[PDB]
């Protein structure tokens, strides 16, 4: 019984970690896109000035 409970806990933790990794990758892609757009706007403003 204890081994089954521990296995279920480990499986739940693994699923949670997979979801966390997916959400982290999505958020990092979004942040990278935002930073690229910010750098482009900065370069444009500097050139215009």
């Amino acid at each position: 019984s204890a081994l089954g409970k521990l296995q279920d806990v480990v499986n739940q933790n693994a699923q949670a970690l997979n979801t966390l990794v997916k959400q982290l990758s999505s958020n990092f892609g979004a942040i990278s896109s935002v930073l690229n757009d910010i750098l482009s706007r900065l370069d444009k403003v500097e050139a215009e000035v």
Binding site: V10, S25, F28, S32
Partner: protein, 50 residues
Amino acid sequence: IKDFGGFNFSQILPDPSKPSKRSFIEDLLFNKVTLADAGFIKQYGDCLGD
């Protein structure tokens, strides 16, 4: 900015073709119900006396 794609957390038994191994451990049924003797334990012992 490296992507988090190479992280594959493995499980124990996600879907191993649904084995469903039936153990059916009958350890409680392994009792020795020993039979009694041929008597002369309470009847003869009380009838003989001294």
